[PDB]
Design a protein around this ligand. Structure first.
Ligand SMILES: [Zn+2]
Lengths: 250, 53, 52
């Protein structure tokens, strides 16, 4: 009954569903190859590969390499991957340095605007272009997606706890994200956000003053363990959206 | 071509793909197609029209 | 007749959703089909004797 009265036979829409799955995979790959721990983990893991680690069949699919171009194809793709890693090592190091500088500026308060963001974007774009054209496999992609989902679940739990602690009198849950997106650099976010509303002062004093501090400490501890803050959130969000679209198409 | 990319796809919107996902320009319709994955005509053509069984 | 076919389909197969042509095909395969409703010649002669 569910199959019949509810589901409709997709006639000539198989190719459309395949294209939708391909688009979802493209979205997931684009969200993965960005300035976060995924690009660093895929770059650091690929640094050991090629010479003494698994260079092919575990990082980049052999079919995807020569798809647009067995023994000859294996050695050809291996040398190309090694050259790409050797050329992108400096870009990945610069991107990691820029991410560390941005995390320090966000944890201290000072805004790094003297070309720091420009250098970070320039170092991240090179790594993204190198990873996208590398045609990597899904083996490490699965672990990266799992780590991103775990980090996103932890962040969502922390945000929900903060919302439940701050929404006692007259606060809501949807405003917590809007407040933390623009009031995350300063450590006294709950103190410098008391512009209007009497419920905010009561929620910040004796209501959630310790909950907000615990959430900020957890976020600071999780930033060093993996990807930093303010950059990995949107990355995991877009990768989760792509995975959800792919699962819906399937 | 459509008016919505693969990222700005919200709920109650068309999802019929146009073009090649591995190409440069690949977007969807992105119109009022609530209560259905695709739009009216695309869902009709994809849902095995003239259903008599 | 469509309502009667739907009722017959619901009685025979309540879980399956009755259709316009599906219900008409069910009754035909049940009684109007000699492949399933294989009434022997003795049955037909007994019917002809009971009711002329
Ligand atoms: Zn459409």
């Amino acid at each position: 009954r569910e199959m019949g009265s509810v589901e409709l036979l997709s006639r000539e829409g198989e190719i459309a569903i395949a294209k939708r799955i391909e688009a979802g995979r493209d979205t997931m790959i684009r969200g993965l190859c960005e300035s976060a721990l995924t690009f660093e983990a895929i770059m650091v893991w690929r640094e050991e590969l090629g010479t003494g680690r698994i260079l092919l069949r575990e990082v980049i699919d052999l079919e995807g390499t020569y798809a647009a171009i067995v023994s000859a194809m294996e050695g050809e793709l291996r040398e190309g991957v090694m050259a790409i890693l050797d050329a992108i090592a400096s870009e990945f190091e610069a991107f990691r340095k820029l991410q560390d500088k941005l995390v320090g500026s966000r944890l201290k308060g000072e805004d790094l605007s003297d070309a720091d963001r420009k250098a970070y974007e320039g170092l991240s774009a090179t790594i993204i272009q190198h990873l996208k054209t590398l045609k990597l496999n899904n083996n490490r992609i699965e672990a990266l997606v799992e780590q991103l989902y775990a980090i996103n679940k932890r962040l969502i739990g922390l945000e929900g706890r903060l919302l439940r602690l701050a929404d006692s009198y007259g606060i809501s849950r949807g405003e917590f994200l809007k407040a933390y997106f623009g009031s995350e650099l300063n450590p006294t976010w709950s103190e410098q956000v008391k512009a209007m509303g009497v419920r905010w002062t009561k929620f910040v004093e004796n209501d959630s003053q310790s909950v907000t501090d615990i959430r900020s400490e957890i976020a600071a501890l999780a930033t060093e363990t993996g990807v930093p803050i303010d950059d990995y959130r949107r990355i995991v969000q877009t990768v989760q959206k792509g995975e959800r679209e792919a699962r819906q198409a399937k | 071509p459509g008016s919505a990319t693969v990222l700005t796809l919200g709920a109650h919107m068309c999802k019929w793909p146009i073009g090649d996902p591995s190409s440069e320009g690949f977007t969807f319709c992105g119109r009022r197609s609530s209560e259905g994955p695709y739009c009216v005509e695309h869902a009709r053509v994809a849902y095995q029209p003239q259903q008599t069984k | 007749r469509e309502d009667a076919l739907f009722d017959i389909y619901r009685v025979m197969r309540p879980g399956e959703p009755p259709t316009v042509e599906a219900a008409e095909a069910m009754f035909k395969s049940l009684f109007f089909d000699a492949e399933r409703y294989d009434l022997s010649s003795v049955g037909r002669v007994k019917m002809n004797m009971r009711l002329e």
